[PDB]
Amino acid sequence: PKIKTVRGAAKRFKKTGKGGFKHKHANLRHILTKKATKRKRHLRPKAMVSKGDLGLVIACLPYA
Amino acid sequence: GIREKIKLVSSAGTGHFYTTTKNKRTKPEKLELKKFDPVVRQHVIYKEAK
Amino acid sequence: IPWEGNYSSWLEQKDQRLAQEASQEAARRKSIEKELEWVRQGTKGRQSKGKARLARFEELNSTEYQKRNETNELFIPPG
Amino acid sequence: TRNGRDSEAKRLGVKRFGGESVLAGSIIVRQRGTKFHAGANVGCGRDHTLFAKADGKVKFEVKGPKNRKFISIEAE
Amino acid sequence: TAEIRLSDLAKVEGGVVDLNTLKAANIIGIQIEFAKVILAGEVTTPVTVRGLRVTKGARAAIEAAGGKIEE
RNA sequence: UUUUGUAUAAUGGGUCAGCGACUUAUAUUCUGUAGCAAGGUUAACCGAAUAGGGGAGCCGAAGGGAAACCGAGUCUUAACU
RNA sequence: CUUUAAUGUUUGAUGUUCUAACGUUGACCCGUAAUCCGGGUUGCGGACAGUGUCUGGUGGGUAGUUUGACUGGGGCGGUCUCCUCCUAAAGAGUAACGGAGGAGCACGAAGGUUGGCUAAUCCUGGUCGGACAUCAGGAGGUUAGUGCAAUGGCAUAAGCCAGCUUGACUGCGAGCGUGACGGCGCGAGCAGGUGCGAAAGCAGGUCAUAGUGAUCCGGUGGUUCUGAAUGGAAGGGCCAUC
Ligand SMILES: [Mg+2]
Ligand SMILES: [Mg+2]
Ligand SMILES: [Mg+2]
Ligand SMILES: [Mg+2]
Ligand SMILES: [Mg+2]
Ligand SMILES: [Mg+2]
Ligand SMILES: [Mg+2]
Ligand SMILES: [Mg+2]
Ligand SMILES: [Mg+2]
Ligand SMILES: [Mg+2]
Ligand SMILES: [Mg+2]
Ligand SMILES: [Mg+2]
Ligand SMILES: [Mg+2]
Ligand SMILES: [Mg+2]
Ligand SMILES: [Mg+2]
Ligand SMILES: [Mg+2]
Ligand SMILES: [Mg+2]
Ligand SMILES: [Mg+2]
Ligand SMILES: [Mg+2]
Ligand SMILES: [Mg+2]
Ligand SMILES: [Mg+2]
């Protein structure tokens, strides 16, 4: 049987040119008024997954 | 807590608004300031809204 | 509250409503005393004490609006 | 027992010491008050943190009529 | 939609490049409707692209060999 | 065997002989080795059939962006030194 | 067009009457040599009762489960996130049901500039007035003050007093600090507009450190980015926000 991908993860990480994964920053969904504009704008661009958590992601998306 | 969120709608007709907290009890008067509107790229007057 | 009739008929219904609300208030007060005594009682061994009962008592601590201005005799300082 | 709570450590202190070559913008000291005042070629943030304003060498000095410690960056 | 390498234009047909003549040489999928020619390979022959969306960089390379890009 | 730690008065075993526990499809990643090499390889199936056909298809040679889209660049942005 | 006053007239409700649906665990006859069942006459009810679908109430009668952790054994008691000091051994970090205190905010000015000013306490004199109110001059030297705990700061004031004000701006960001990660913090400088000042300049909130909550699901504005034959639309996506 082919490995079933974790469908939740395929909605949050996208592969890149070299082999790293790109994800979206958290803390940008709701009650933001207390957050400084500097903090809001620094979370807008998409980030890349760190070193420690890379192992747990390749497990979830074998085919991606 | 007695300060409740308000939004400062713009006055250039575009859809753009800031948000802040205002004491609706001791300041019943509405706010209006001069803020930047990045749609028309000008310093226009921002009036108080819902 | 919509009432169909005249002022004289509606005034009695208004008074009845106030009397019933005061009676229900007193009943709720007495219930709160009775449950507070049980909350403050002991434990009697290694037994329950009823977390569900505690939650019910905590829920029973609600609030109601006293009639905003049942204003009474004003003040006039003679000179 | 009533007490028994505490706050996370804020990790303040001197991050770069004397004679250390820094790059522009690097933090020199994380501060609560102003124990170290801003000399030439350094800044002062809202958190009273002293950040480098030009790459060089860190130099602690005691200039001033009240003997208050100053940090300034030599240009190298 | 599918990419097209520049080098792939040498395996197509007697000169014309088109959606049907691209997929008749197993360069693109059968159900690929749109395509775009990319500066990735090298060409020498005078290929005439029938209808496609060759880029700005690759257009200056097709005509260099002697091609023609019409619609 | 389990433990910080056992001659331990902690566990197991009366003794011999026979049996008794990391395996098997499929899929994916890495390593070694072998074949070809900007190419590599077939599946079902056909077949006097471990040959030979079958290139449907899969991976790779191009990336960026949520997407249209652009393209060795792209996204952000009114625009980037 | 206005009030109503009538007779027709459709519908709705509340009733009374009837017989033909339906009930009969009333009587008689037949199948039949059968207190079952069926059929036929005859009464008694009768559009009720009863059953089917939908629906509100009740329902431990029955069934499926839940009922946290730390803990000088468990239970009872206390506690669970954030800030300040000490323990903490002169970098950073460092435990216990160790020793002491706070937070779940506030402010369209208590924010930004430009001007100006500098406290607590004590003494002498003086109308009501004293131990202490306001005035005068001497010692004084921060024992003062900070919007709210404590520590570190503050005279160039970060404390006090006024003018004009909205930078409590939009897009970015060299480079660093701290985290296992999620994340959090500091930031010169660049571009577009802006306030204060004669300018040099300062301003991307408040002397700093607490004043908080991921994801999912959904709500409200903007944007043809997408739109399942095509044109639209619904629904998604992106930005702002709840
Ligand atoms: Mg959103
Ligand atoms: Mg093919
Ligand atoms: Mg061991
Ligand atoms: Mg033991
Ligand atoms: Mg021994
Ligand atoms: Mg033994
Ligand atoms: Mg023995
Ligand atoms: Mg045992
Ligand atoms: Mg034994
Ligand atoms: Mg691509
Ligand atoms: Mg039960
Ligand atoms: Mg079960
Ligand atoms: Mg326990
Ligand atoms: Mg030490
Ligand atoms: Mg230390
Ligand atoms: Mg202030
Ligand atoms: Mg000043
Ligand atoms: Mg100030
Ligand atoms: Mg403060
Ligand atoms: Mg359509
Ligand atoms: Mg939408």
PDB file of all heavy atoms in Angstrom, chain A residues 1-3 16-17 22 46 62-63, chain F residues 25-29 63-66:
ATOM      1  N   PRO A   1       0.813  -1.216   0.000  1.00  0.00           N
ATOM      2  CA  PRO A   1       0.000   0.000   0.000  1.00  0.00           C
ATOM      3  C   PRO A   1       0.846   1.265   0.000  1.00  0.00           C
ATOM      4  O   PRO A   1       1.770   1.381   0.801  1.00  0.00           O
ATOM      5  CB  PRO A   1      -0.798  -0.114   1.301  1.00  0.00           C
ATOM      6  CG  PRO A   1      -0.787  -1.550   1.634  1.00  0.00           C
ATOM      7  CD  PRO A   1       0.533  -2.058   1.172  1.00  0.00           C
ATOM      8  N   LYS A   2       0.526   2.202  -0.887  1.00  0.00           N
ATOM      9  CA  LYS A   2       1.233   3.472  -0.915  1.00  0.00           C
ATOM     10  C   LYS A   2       1.040   4.197   0.409  1.00  0.00           C
ATOM     11  O   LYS A   2       0.037   4.010   1.100  1.00  0.00           O
ATOM     12  CB  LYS A   2       0.725   4.330  -2.072  1.00  0.00           C
ATOM     13  CG  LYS A   2       0.366   3.530  -3.307  1.00  0.00           C
ATOM     14  CD  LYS A   2       0.614   4.310  -4.581  1.00  0.00           C
ATOM     15  CE  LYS A   2      -0.530   5.252  -4.890  1.00  0.00           C
ATOM     16  NZ  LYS A   2      -1.713   4.555  -5.459  1.00  0.00           N
ATOM     17  N   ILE A   3       2.020   5.019   0.779  1.00  0.00           N
ATOM     18  CA  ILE A   3       1.929   5.726   2.050  1.00  0.00           C
ATOM     19  C   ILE A   3       0.870   6.810   1.926  1.00  0.00           C
ATOM     20  O   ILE A   3       0.938   7.663   1.036  1.00  0.00           O
ATOM     21  CB  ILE A   3       3.271   6.339   2.455  1.00  0.00           C
ATOM     22  CG1 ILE A   3       4.268   5.269   2.842  1.00  0.00           C
ATOM     23  CG2 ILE A   3       3.084   7.242   3.641  1.00  0.00           C
ATOM     24  CD1 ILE A   3       5.361   5.177   1.858  1.00  0.00           C
ATOM     25  N   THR A  16      10.148  23.603  -1.758  1.00  0.00           N
ATOM     26  CA  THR A  16      10.872  24.666  -2.438  1.00  0.00           C
ATOM     27  C   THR A  16      11.916  24.069  -3.381  1.00  0.00           C
ATOM     28  O   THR A  16      11.965  22.859  -3.607  1.00  0.00           O
ATOM     29  CB  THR A  16      11.512  25.617  -1.428  1.00  0.00           C
ATOM     30  OG1 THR A  16      12.107  24.859  -0.370  1.00  0.00           O
ATOM     31  CG2 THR A  16      10.465  26.546  -0.848  1.00  0.00           C
ATOM     32  N   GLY A  17      12.753  24.944  -3.936  1.00  0.00           N
ATOM     33  CA  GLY A  17      13.657  24.527  -4.994  1.00  0.00           C
ATOM     34  C   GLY A  17      14.734  23.565  -4.534  1.00  0.00           C
ATOM     35  O   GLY A  17      15.102  22.645  -5.266  1.00  0.00           O
ATOM     36  N   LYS A  22       8.256  25.650   3.081  1.00  0.00           N
ATOM     37  CA  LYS A  22       7.834  27.023   3.315  1.00  0.00           C
ATOM     38  C   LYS A  22       6.448  27.018   3.939  1.00  0.00           C
ATOM     39  O   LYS A  22       5.546  26.338   3.443  1.00  0.00           O
ATOM     40  CB  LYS A  22       7.840  27.817   2.007  1.00  0.00           C
ATOM     41  CG  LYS A  22       6.804  28.911   1.923  1.00  0.00           C
ATOM     42  CD  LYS A  22       6.517  29.284   0.479  1.00  0.00           C
ATOM     43  CE  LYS A  22       5.624  28.265  -0.201  1.00  0.00           C
ATOM     44  NZ  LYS A  22       5.187  28.722  -1.546  1.00  0.00           N
ATOM     45  N   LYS A  46       5.987  34.830   3.985  1.00  0.00           N
ATOM     46  CA  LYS A  46       6.105  33.415   4.307  1.00  0.00           C
ATOM     47  C   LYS A  46       7.519  33.070   4.757  1.00  0.00           C
ATOM     48  O   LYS A  46       8.507  33.586   4.232  1.00  0.00           O
ATOM     49  CB  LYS A  46       5.730  32.562   3.100  1.00  0.00           C
ATOM     50  CG  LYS A  46       4.383  32.890   2.504  1.00  0.00           C
ATOM     51  CD  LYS A  46       3.328  31.909   2.962  1.00  0.00           C
ATOM     52  CE  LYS A  46       2.025  32.110   2.207  1.00  0.00           C
ATOM     53  NZ  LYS A  46       1.296  33.338   2.635  1.00  0.00           N
ATOM     54  N   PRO A  62       5.605  12.241   2.402  1.00  0.00           N
ATOM     55  CA  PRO A  62       6.606  11.462   1.669  1.00  0.00           C
ATOM     56  C   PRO A  62       6.569  11.738   0.176  1.00  0.00           C
ATOM     57  O   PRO A  62       7.607  11.730  -0.491  1.00  0.00           O
ATOM     58  CB  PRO A  62       6.217  10.017   1.983  1.00  0.00           C
ATOM     59  CG  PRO A  62       4.769  10.079   2.221  1.00  0.00           C
ATOM     60  CD  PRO A  62       4.492  11.401   2.867  1.00  0.00           C
ATOM     61  N   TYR A  63       5.373  11.990  -0.352  1.00  0.00           N
ATOM     62  CA  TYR A  63       5.167  12.195  -1.778  1.00  0.00           C
ATOM     63  C   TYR A  63       5.279  13.649  -2.197  1.00  0.00           C
ATOM     64  O   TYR A  63       5.205  13.937  -3.396  1.00  0.00           O
ATOM     65  CB  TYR A  63       3.795  11.670  -2.187  1.00  0.00           C
ATOM     66  CG  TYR A  63       3.715  10.176  -2.191  1.00  0.00           C
ATOM     67  CD1 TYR A  63       3.032   9.502  -1.198  1.00  0.00           C
ATOM     68  CD2 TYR A  63       4.340   9.439  -3.174  1.00  0.00           C
ATOM     69  CE1 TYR A  63       2.961   8.138  -1.193  1.00  0.00           C
ATOM     70  CE2 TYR A  63       4.272   8.074  -3.178  1.00  0.00           C
ATOM     71  CZ  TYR A  63       3.582   7.429  -2.185  1.00  0.00           C
ATOM     72  OH  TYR A  63       3.513   6.059  -2.182  1.00  0.00           O
TER      73      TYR A  63
ATOM     74  P     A F  25       8.705 -11.104   0.663  1.00  0.00           P
ATOM     75  OP1   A F  25       8.449 -11.618  -0.701  1.00  0.00           O
ATOM     76  OP2   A F  25      10.080 -10.774   1.099  1.00  0.00           O
ATOM     77  O5'   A F  25       7.808  -9.809   0.849  1.00  0.00           O
ATOM     78  C5'   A F  25       7.193  -9.187  -0.266  1.00  0.00           C
ATOM     79  C4'   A F  25       5.704  -9.419  -0.268  1.00  0.00           C
ATOM     80  O4'   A F  25       5.177  -9.261   1.067  1.00  0.00           O
ATOM     81  C3'   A F  25       4.883  -8.453  -1.097  1.00  0.00           C
ATOM     82  O3'   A F  25       4.903  -8.775  -2.471  1.00  0.00           O
ATOM     83  C2'   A F  25       3.503  -8.567  -0.469  1.00  0.00           C
ATOM     84  O2'   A F  25       2.832  -9.719  -0.951  1.00  0.00           O
ATOM     85  C1'   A F  25       3.850  -8.796   1.002  1.00  0.00           C
ATOM     86  N9    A F  25       3.706  -7.577   1.817  1.00  0.00           N
ATOM     87  C8    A F  25       2.631  -6.728   1.799  1.00  0.00           C
ATOM     88  N7    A F  25       2.720  -5.731   2.639  1.00  0.00           N
ATOM     89  C5    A F  25       3.932  -5.947   3.262  1.00  0.00           C
ATOM     90  C6    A F  25       4.592  -5.227   4.256  1.00  0.00           C
ATOM     91  N6    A F  25       4.103  -4.121   4.803  1.00  0.00           N
ATOM     92  N1    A F  25       5.782  -5.687   4.671  1.00  0.00           N
ATOM     93  C2    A F  25       6.259  -6.800   4.104  1.00  0.00           C
ATOM     94  N3    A F  25       5.730  -7.569   3.161  1.00  0.00           N
ATOM     95  C4    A F  25       4.547  -7.083   2.778  1.00  0.00           C
ATOM     96  P     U F  26       5.550  -7.749  -3.514  1.00  0.00           P
ATOM     97  OP1   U F  26       5.542  -8.386  -4.854  1.00  0.00           O
ATOM     98  OP2   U F  26       6.820  -7.247  -2.933  1.00  0.00           O
ATOM     99  O5'   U F  26       4.515  -6.544  -3.535  1.00  0.00           O
ATOM    100  C5'   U F  26       4.950  -5.225  -3.809  1.00  0.00           C
ATOM    101  C4'   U F  26       4.028  -4.210  -3.193  1.00  0.00           C
ATOM    102  O4'   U F  26       3.782  -4.549  -1.805  1.00  0.00           O
ATOM    103  C3'   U F  26       4.558  -2.791  -3.134  1.00  0.00           C
ATOM    104  O3'   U F  26       4.421  -2.103  -4.361  1.00  0.00           O
ATOM    105  C2'   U F  26       3.744  -2.187  -2.004  1.00  0.00           C
ATOM    106  O2'   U F  26       2.436  -1.869  -2.453  1.00  0.00           O
ATOM    107  C1'   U F  26       3.646  -3.371  -1.043  1.00  0.00           C
ATOM    108  N1    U F  26       4.710  -3.349  -0.017  1.00  0.00           N
ATOM    109  C2    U F  26       4.647  -2.382   0.953  1.00  0.00           C
ATOM    110  O2    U F  26       3.770  -1.545   1.002  1.00  0.00           O
ATOM    111  N3    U F  26       5.652  -2.408   1.877  1.00  0.00           N
ATOM    112  C4    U F  26       6.699  -3.302   1.926  1.00  0.00           C
ATOM    113  O4    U F  26       7.537  -3.208   2.820  1.00  0.00           O
ATOM    114  C5    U F  26       6.694  -4.280   0.890  1.00  0.00           C
ATOM    115  C6    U F  26       5.721  -4.270  -0.022  1.00  0.00           C
ATOM    116  P     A F  27       5.650  -1.257  -4.945  1.00  0.00           P
ATOM    117  OP1   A F  27       5.324  -0.897  -6.346  1.00  0.00           O
ATOM    118  OP2   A F  27       6.903  -1.985  -4.637  1.00  0.00           O
ATOM    119  O5'   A F  27       5.633   0.077  -4.082  1.00  0.00           O
ATOM    120  C5'   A F  27       4.520   0.951  -4.132  1.00  0.00           C
ATOM    121  C4'   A F  27       4.550   1.946  -3.003  1.00  0.00           C
ATOM    122  O4'   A F  27       4.463   1.256  -1.735  1.00  0.00           O
ATOM    123  C3'   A F  27       5.811   2.779  -2.877  1.00  0.00           C
ATOM    124  O3'   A F  27       5.838   3.867  -3.781  1.00  0.00           O
ATOM    125  C2'   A F  27       5.772   3.210  -1.419  1.00  0.00           C
ATOM    126  O2'   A F  27       4.869   4.289  -1.253  1.00  0.00           O
ATOM    127  C1'   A F  27       5.165   1.978  -0.750  1.00  0.00           C
ATOM    128  N9    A F  27       6.175   1.101  -0.133  1.00  0.00           N
ATOM    129  C8    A F  27       6.595  -0.143  -0.513  1.00  0.00           C
ATOM    130  N7    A F  27       7.509  -0.657   0.275  1.00  0.00           N
ATOM    131  C5    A F  27       7.700   0.315   1.243  1.00  0.00           C
ATOM    132  C6    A F  27       8.530   0.402   2.372  1.00  0.00           C
ATOM    133  N6    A F  27       9.378  -0.549   2.750  1.00  0.00           N
ATOM    134  N1    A F  27       8.468   1.517   3.125  1.00  0.00           N
ATOM    135  C2    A F  27       7.625   2.472   2.749  1.00  0.00           C
ATOM    136  N3    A F  27       6.798   2.502   1.720  1.00  0.00           N
ATOM    137  C4    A F  27       6.883   1.389   0.997  1.00  0.00           C
ATOM    138  P     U F  28       7.235   4.417  -4.348  1.00  0.00           P
ATOM    139  OP1   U F  28       6.937   5.434  -5.381  1.00  0.00           O
ATOM    140  OP2   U F  28       8.082   3.251  -4.695  1.00  0.00           O
ATOM    141  O5'   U F  28       7.888   5.171  -3.109  1.00  0.00           O
ATOM    142  C5'   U F  28       7.373   6.415  -2.662  1.00  0.00           C
ATOM    143  C4'   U F  28       8.040   6.863  -1.389  1.00  0.00           C
ATOM    144  O4'   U F  28       7.854   5.851  -0.371  1.00  0.00           O
ATOM    145  C3'   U F  28       9.546   7.044  -1.460  1.00  0.00           C
ATOM    146  O3'   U F  28       9.929   8.300  -1.986  1.00  0.00           O
ATOM    147  C2'   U F  28       9.981   6.840  -0.018  1.00  0.00           C
ATOM    148  O2'   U F  28       9.759   8.014   0.746  1.00  0.00           O
ATOM    149  C1'   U F  28       8.997   5.774   0.449  1.00  0.00           C
ATOM    150  N1    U F  28       9.551   4.408   0.359  1.00  0.00           N
ATOM    151  C2    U F  28      10.428   4.023   1.336  1.00  0.00           C
ATOM    152  O2    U F  28      10.773   4.764   2.233  1.00  0.00           O
ATOM    153  N3    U F  28      10.902   2.748   1.223  1.00  0.00           N
ATOM    154  C4    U F  28      10.582   1.832   0.254  1.00  0.00           C
ATOM    155  O4    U F  28      11.092   0.717   0.292  1.00  0.00           O
ATOM    156  C5    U F  28       9.658   2.300  -0.722  1.00  0.00           C
ATOM    157  C6    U F  28       9.185   3.543  -0.636  1.00  0.00           C
ATOM    158  P     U F  29      11.409   8.505  -2.564  1.00  0.00           P
ATOM    159  OP1   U F  29      11.459   9.827  -3.228  1.00  0.00           O
ATOM    160  OP2   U F  29      11.774   7.285  -3.318  1.00  0.00           O
ATOM    161  O5'   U F  29      12.334   8.565  -1.271  1.00  0.00           O
ATOM    162  C5'   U F  29      12.461   9.760  -0.519  1.00  0.00           C
ATOM    163  C4'   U F  29      13.419   9.592   0.633  1.00  0.00           C
ATOM    164  O4'   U F  29      12.990   8.487   1.467  1.00  0.00           O
ATOM    165  C3'   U F  29      14.850   9.235   0.271  1.00  0.00           C
ATOM    166  O3'   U F  29      15.623  10.347  -0.133  1.00  0.00           O
ATOM    167  C2'   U F  29      15.355   8.585   1.547  1.00  0.00           C
ATOM    168  O2'   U F  29      15.640   9.574   2.524  1.00  0.00           O
ATOM    169  C1'   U F  29      14.116   7.822   1.999  1.00  0.00           C
ATOM    170  N1    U F  29      14.103   6.421   1.527  1.00  0.00           N
ATOM    171  C2    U F  29      14.864   5.496   2.199  1.00  0.00           C
ATOM    172  O2    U F  29      15.569   5.777   3.146  1.00  0.00           O
ATOM    173  N3    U F  29      14.785   4.218   1.718  1.00  0.00           N
ATOM    174  C4    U F  29      14.033   3.773   0.661  1.00  0.00           C
ATOM    175  O4    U F  29      14.067   2.585   0.350  1.00  0.00           O
ATOM    176  C5    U F  29      13.267   4.785   0.020  1.00  0.00           C
ATOM    177  C6    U F  29      13.324   6.038   0.470  1.00  0.00           C
ATOM    178  P     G F  63      11.851  23.495 -10.497  1.00  0.00           P
ATOM    179  OP1   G F  63      12.992  22.603 -10.201  1.00  0.00           O
ATOM    180  OP2   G F  63      10.480  22.943 -10.558  1.00  0.00           O
ATOM    181  O5'   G F  63      11.849  24.644  -9.398  1.00  0.00           O
ATOM    182  C5'   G F  63      13.062  25.258  -8.996  1.00  0.00           C
ATOM    183  C4'   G F  63      12.996  26.764  -9.073  1.00  0.00           C
ATOM    184  O4'   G F  63      12.817  27.194 -10.443  1.00  0.00           O
ATOM    185  C3'   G F  63      11.858  27.435  -8.335  1.00  0.00           C
ATOM    186  O3'   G F  63      12.095  27.541  -6.945  1.00  0.00           O
ATOM    187  C2'   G F  63      11.770  28.784  -9.032  1.00  0.00           C
ATOM    188  O2'   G F  63      12.793  29.647  -8.568  1.00  0.00           O
ATOM    189  C1'   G F  63      12.091  28.403 -10.472  1.00  0.00           C
ATOM    190  N9    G F  63      10.877  28.204 -11.275  1.00  0.00           N
ATOM    191  C8    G F  63      10.307  27.003 -11.590  1.00  0.00           C
ATOM    192  N7    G F  63       9.238  27.124 -12.320  1.00  0.00           N
ATOM    193  C5    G F  63       9.103  28.490 -12.496  1.00  0.00           C
ATOM    194  C6    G F  63       8.121  29.216 -13.200  1.00  0.00           C
ATOM    195  O6    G F  63       7.157  28.776 -13.831  1.00  0.00           O
ATOM    196  N1    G F  63       8.347  30.581 -13.130  1.00  0.00           N
ATOM    197  C2    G F  63       9.386  31.171 -12.464  1.00  0.00           C
ATOM    198  N2    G F  63       9.440  32.506 -12.506  1.00  0.00           N
ATOM    199  N3    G F  63      10.309  30.501 -11.799  1.00  0.00           N
ATOM    200  C4    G F  63      10.106  29.173 -11.858  1.00  0.00           C
ATOM    201  P     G F  64      10.861  27.634  -5.929  1.00  0.00           P
ATOM    202  OP1   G F  64      11.397  27.567  -4.554  1.00  0.00           O
ATOM    203  OP2   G F  64       9.844  26.656  -6.368  1.00  0.00           O
ATOM    204  O5'   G F  64      10.283  29.097  -6.157  1.00  0.00           O
ATOM    205  C5'   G F  64      11.068  30.241  -5.866  1.00  0.00           C
ATOM    206  C4'   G F  64      10.368  31.514  -6.263  1.00  0.00           C
ATOM    207  O4'   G F  64      10.179  31.548  -7.696  1.00  0.00           O
ATOM    208  C3'   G F  64       8.973  31.715  -5.707  1.00  0.00           C
ATOM    209  O3'   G F  64       8.985  32.194  -4.377  1.00  0.00           O
ATOM    210  C2'   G F  64       8.364  32.701  -6.691  1.00  0.00           C
ATOM    211  O2'   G F  64       8.816  34.015  -6.412  1.00  0.00           O
ATOM    212  C1'   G F  64       9.001  32.258  -8.005  1.00  0.00           C
ATOM    213  N9    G F  64       8.125  31.397  -8.818  1.00  0.00           N
ATOM    214  C8    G F  64       8.202  30.036  -8.924  1.00  0.00           C
ATOM    215  N7    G F  64       7.319  29.535  -9.734  1.00  0.00           N
ATOM    216  C5    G F  64       6.621  30.631 -10.198  1.00  0.00           C
ATOM    217  C6    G F  64       5.542  30.702 -11.106  1.00  0.00           C
ATOM    218  O6    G F  64       4.971  29.782 -11.695  1.00  0.00           O
ATOM    219  N1    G F  64       5.118  32.006 -11.310  1.00  0.00           N
ATOM    220  C2    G F  64       5.669  33.104 -10.711  1.00  0.00           C
ATOM    221  N2    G F  64       5.130  34.287 -11.027  1.00  0.00           N
ATOM    222  N3    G F  64       6.682  33.052  -9.861  1.00  0.00           N
ATOM    223  C4    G F  64       7.105  31.791  -9.649  1.00  0.00           C
ATOM    224  P     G F  65       7.936  31.627  -3.308  1.00  0.00           P
ATOM    225  OP1   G F  65       8.284  32.163  -1.974  1.00  0.00           O
ATOM    226  OP2   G F  65       7.826  30.166  -3.511  1.00  0.00           O
ATOM    227  O5'   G F  65       6.556  32.279  -3.746  1.00  0.00           O
ATOM    228  C5'   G F  65       6.373  33.682  -3.703  1.00  0.00           C
ATOM    229  C4'   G F  65       5.098  34.095  -4.390  1.00  0.00           C
ATOM    230  O4'   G F  65       5.184  33.808  -5.807  1.00  0.00           O
ATOM    231  C3'   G F  65       3.837  33.377  -3.953  1.00  0.00           C
ATOM    232  O3'   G F  65       3.306  33.871  -2.740  1.00  0.00           O
ATOM    233  C2'   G F  65       2.920  33.580  -5.147  1.00  0.00           C
ATOM    234  O2'   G F  65       2.388  34.894  -5.146  1.00  0.00           O
ATOM    235  C1'   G F  65       3.910  33.466  -6.302  1.00  0.00           C
ATOM    236  N9    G F  65       3.970  32.095  -6.827  1.00  0.00           N
ATOM    237  C8    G F  65       4.783  31.085  -6.399  1.00  0.00           C
ATOM    238  N7    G F  65       4.604  29.977  -7.056  1.00  0.00           N
ATOM    239  C5    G F  65       3.611  30.279  -7.970  1.00  0.00           C
ATOM    240  C6    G F  65       2.998  29.474  -8.953  1.00  0.00           C
ATOM    241  O6    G F  65       3.220  28.291  -9.223  1.00  0.00           O
ATOM    242  N1    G F  65       2.039  30.180  -9.660  1.00  0.00           N
ATOM    243  C2    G F  65       1.711  31.489  -9.447  1.00  0.00           C
ATOM    244  N2    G F  65       0.755  31.995 -10.232  1.00  0.00           N
ATOM    245  N3    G F  65       2.274  32.250  -8.534  1.00  0.00           N
ATOM    246  C4    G F  65       3.207  31.582  -7.839  1.00  0.00           C
ATOM    247  P     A F  66       2.729  32.847  -1.649  1.00  0.00           P
ATOM    248  OP1   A F  66       2.013  33.637  -0.623  1.00  0.00           O
ATOM    249  OP2   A F  66       3.826  31.940  -1.248  1.00  0.00           O
ATOM    250  O5'   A F  66       1.660  31.988  -2.454  1.00  0.00           O
ATOM    251  C5'   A F  66       1.095  30.816  -1.891  1.00  0.00           C
ATOM    252  C4'   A F  66      -0.346  30.649  -2.298  1.00  0.00           C
ATOM    253  O4'   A F  66      -1.133  31.723  -1.739  1.00  0.00           O
ATOM    254  C3'   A F  66      -0.626  30.713  -3.789  1.00  0.00           C
ATOM    255  O3'   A F  66      -0.417  29.466  -4.421  1.00  0.00           O
ATOM    256  C2'   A F  66      -2.078  31.167  -3.847  1.00  0.00           C
ATOM    257  O2'   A F  66      -2.944  30.061  -3.663  1.00  0.00           O
ATOM    258  C1'   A F  66      -2.181  32.061  -2.614  1.00  0.00           C
ATOM    259  N9    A F  66      -2.096  33.501  -2.911  1.00  0.00           N
ATOM    260  C8    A F  66      -1.046  34.336  -2.649  1.00  0.00           C
ATOM    261  N7    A F  66      -1.260  35.579  -2.988  1.00  0.00           N
ATOM    262  C5    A F  66      -2.546  35.565  -3.495  1.00  0.00           C
ATOM    263  C6    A F  66      -3.360  36.577  -4.024  1.00  0.00           C
ATOM    264  N6    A F  66      -2.989  37.850  -4.137  1.00  0.00           N
ATOM    265  N1    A F  66      -4.591  36.232  -4.441  1.00  0.00           N
ATOM    266  C2    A F  66      -4.964  34.955  -4.329  1.00  0.00           C
ATOM    267  N3    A F  66      -4.291  33.916  -3.850  1.00  0.00           N
ATOM    268  C4    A F  66      -3.074  34.293  -3.445  1.00  0.00           C
TER     269        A F  66
END
